[PDB]
Symmetry: D2
Subunit: 313 residues, 4 copies
């Protein structure tokens, strides 16, 4: 029912976002496009094929996009997602799903221009390089897109730096382009995603689904959990990306606040920060909004329900 | 018992900080030094004499300091404190208290070098210009000062801009100097001070003290209240400065968190922000700390108690 | 013999660069692509059609490109080239030359990928937005391009600001992208172009060609001259753009120095400056080089010779 | 006849500036104050005593100043002036000249406030830290000072970086303070000082003076020459500092241009650059001017003449 384009950089959590987008009956996945981020474009694209195979996805093109940030030098997060970007999974000899011939930037422009206006929503869960290129190359897509729901940012938290979130800092100028176009933007930041904890009970409910995709998720969630407990301290791992897809499925999974948000491009300490203006006489008629509280039970409900529907292909 | 130097820029709330510092039996006021900020150095200095007269202070030198920020152009806040900086009070023909001969920067260096090590705590409630100059002119004072407790900043709130607080933004390089010296710094920021609301009950308890200093405070608190309800929206006015003195009197009036804090000097959107790093594996052995929650009843208790002791000189 | 793609923003001097590129027998013009700059993309594209008509060009596609800088806000130079961007010329009811269907960015990628390696040289004489987009969208073109010869910058002079040249400052990030790719870049900056003065003798030699294209050039050169004598003071006008094409025709028209050049993105006073490092132990194996001295007679010789060959179509 | 305060950081060339200031009959040296720069404050101060002793100076106070830049971290040039800062000279067991008790910042303010207006000219040949502190601590000195003639900067050359000169970059905010006060500033930059070469003929004329001060200069000039020929390539060494004193003695030793000059504080490539605006409709009524061409013979004449007058004390 809801057509989306999932632009991601398959690392541990992006994989869960793909499973959720596939398994849920409310989402119609038009394409999976990749960008540099968690790992280099090549690795990330190979990972998208791997999970698309595991979940038995067919009829959905997987197109690679930009292999470098717009202006800045490449910066990846291999210390979180392993060298492969997919933690510790072994790849098949051959993938059933092949990388499309078109450049993700062209495919996105193609899909948006060929479909009826306001029917596609973009869901970026990686750096915003491909979305910004597309918006600049064919500005007509900004008024046709239904809305953009991205995982990135943090109005009061950061991870890459004390105040900046990874997806935004790896390409601040692309983020600046996206947040400043007139389309509707929902920022599902760390403020929210730090609530999407994969606790023991949840992992247990997952193990009980007892299917191949489920054993896969259990395996990567395990690796992800080991990293978070050590590296960037938390009792459990936060699985960010699925939260951006969950909001498209059912907006009631989270509360949102409508506030102005811009991107810092020159600060020495604040480079890459999503600056939100919460001072009250609030704007009214503001094209951006941030996510605040997550309905933990409903969120995990949607994931498990998706895992069950995918079954064992 | 606790010797302090109060460096301020007498506007509405700085006045209350002076009354509290004078009236409380726990504080020994060595000097009141002034800086540009709420108004121009001249106005602010005249204001410090006015309240020093009203509270009947004697034996305490009032020394003017820097009339301009270290590098940036002058920026004042006359729209909040009126043209006089002291809102709407009429000045006497002659002041009993006279402005000292020495420059505040020299007086501060003098007091610190002549007293025993670790016995004086600096309490800046204005721009940090004089403190920075002093520390650069005689670096020996940083190891002798007991600690610095300033009113300024905001780890998650701002007023001058969406993320920056007035005292820090009027002279970012001075703030950068102060936060980076090795002395202990307690930042009593907007996060805390926005809790020190002067509500009707409080103003009523004040009117009942029925003394001249009290009528004075009631008068300025009134003007301050009119501005906050209009200009920078809030139901009541937040009286910031006294909070910095209250912490010196009794540290239990507020909770504090020990985290790294630095000042942004080049950001376009974030100039002057006090960037705090709350990401956990927290530092341990960190010379800065921010104030979080205020004990509202104890705070106002201290103020009224001081108003009563000052009496009617 | 020398295949080029002229990327420009038709204003007064870009027009002369087109005439020279068309009339000279050494240049083979594959396409004329436009960008925002002197005027808005629409105006500039209409202007390119106007001069293509006047010079009787046929068989050469004119494709429009980016209508906005990559990240910054649009900035034009209508005070130098008039509102139309073409000073004071009247446009025809219909143009014989039509704007191509393809986006300049796609056309450039097309031409370069379809021709033999190292046979096309890019000649940008406007902001660098289209060249940067193309290099990011299809990175394979940077190794296939023969070299890039652009009019822009100034190692010791500026015009838009005290140290920055218009073409670079209207899109600093695009310029940063171009100067940092590994292809060979020849910067024909203001240091050189300020020598290409259109003095009375030259204008007289032009009037004598007595053809339509020549009367056209005479007309616009006139307006250009009036502006330079008033606005940005000089005895005569400097016609910048043709110098970039002249270097492709005969490199001996100017001397060049091989030195490192980078673009300043964050300076307050120096935004957009082309910083060149002339300190000696010079690099050796440096992909950029700046133009220094112009052979004035040979330069104008090439222009007049081209005007004569175009004749009167 | 011309009273000056020489603020310097005795390294090889600062020493020659002291000899020239002492030996020339036109200069009346009120004091020699030191700052961090070529070496740490301690070393540089010890060096000033060494040369004051060798030249037999008496009746002139030597006062130390700031040991750190205003905001940035300390940066010295020991690779040019050796570890001692004075290249390779051995120090005496005891110095006849003792370091004054007052801080240079206070001494400078003292001298200027106690003498008649417009009779003292400041001659900084090191980082501008002390001059900026003094102008901020007592703003009354800027209108009393006759003018400031400093060695530093470069409108078209740099040494520390491709576009910035050492003295300015070690403390950009101090420089920004000095160039922005209303006093007259003459900038004797690298553009000029690179002409003051100490060629074999000159060194020979010096050896012939055959006195102790002369043998000293010959010794340090030798070391300085070895460094310049290797490190920062040039056929001979450029002795910068004396050029600033020569201009005070006889302004005709060099040509100057009156143009606006400001300091870049945020650029990534251009930090510390003295940006001069040579675009013409030149200001008229401009408090800054840069030095252009040096009268080589007259310059070295003044130095040798001073060496002869000092004789052999
Ligand atoms: N430590 C860490 C670094 C990168 C990411 C990625 N960036 C976003 C959260 O910062 C998500 O899209 C996630 O894939 C997550 C954890
Ligand atoms: N709007 C407003 C502006 C300035 C201040 C001053 N700055 C600090 C709070 O921002 C306090 O010291 C206070 O005196 C308070 C209100
Ligand atoms: N004043 C002025 C402004 C813009 C330009 C354009 N920019 C470059 C020179 O700055 C050329 O390409 C020219 O078309 C020329 C004059
Ligand atoms: N390489 C080098 C570095 C520092 C200096 C000092 N800085 C100024 C020239 O840059 C002079 O005052 C000189 O003392 C000279 C040479
Ligand atoms: Ca991701
Ligand atoms: Ca205050
Ligand atoms: Ca042009
Ligand atoms: Ca020096």
């Amino acid at each position: 029912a809801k057509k989306i384009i999932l632009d991601c950089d398959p690392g541990l959590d992006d994989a869960v976002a793909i499973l959720l987008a596939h398994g849920n009956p409310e989402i119609e996945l038009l394409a999976i496009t990749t960008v540099v981020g968690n790992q280099t474009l090549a690795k990330v694209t190979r990972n998208a094929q791997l999970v698309a195979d595991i979940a038995g996805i067919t009829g959905v093109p997987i197109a690679a996009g930009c292999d470098k940030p717009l202006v800045r030098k490449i910066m990846t997060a291999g210390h979180i997602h392993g060298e492969s970007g997919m933690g510790t999974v072994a790849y098949p000899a051959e993938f059933k799903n092949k990388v499309d011939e078109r450049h993700a930037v062209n495919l996105i422009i193609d899909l948006v221009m060929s479909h009826e206006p306001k029917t596609i929503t973009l869901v970026p869960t990686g750096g915003l390089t491909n979305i910004a290129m597309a918006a600049r190359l064919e500005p007509r897509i900004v008024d046709r897109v239904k809305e953009v729901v991205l995982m990135g940012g943090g109005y009061h938290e950061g991870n890459a730096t004390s105040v900046a979130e990874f997806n935004i800092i790896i390409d601040p100028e692309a983020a600046h382009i996206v947040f400043n176009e007139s389309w509707q933007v929902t920022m599902v930041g760390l403020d929210l995603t730090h609530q999407a904890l994969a606790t023991p009970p949840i992992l247990q409910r997952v193990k009980e689904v007892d299917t191949n995709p489920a054993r896969f998720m259990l395996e990567i969630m395990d690796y992800y959990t080991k990293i978070y407990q050590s590296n960037r301290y938390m009792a459990a791992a936060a699985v960010h990306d699925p939260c951006a897809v969950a909001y498209v499925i059912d907006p009631s999974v989270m509360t949102t606040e409508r506030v102005p948000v811009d991107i810092e491009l020159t600060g020495k300490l604040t480079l890459g920060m999503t600056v939100a203006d919460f001072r009250n006489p609030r704007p009214e008629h503001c094209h951006t909004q941030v996510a605040v509280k997550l309905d933990f039970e409903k969120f995990w409900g949607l994931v498990l329900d998706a895992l069950e529907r995918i079954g064992d292909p």
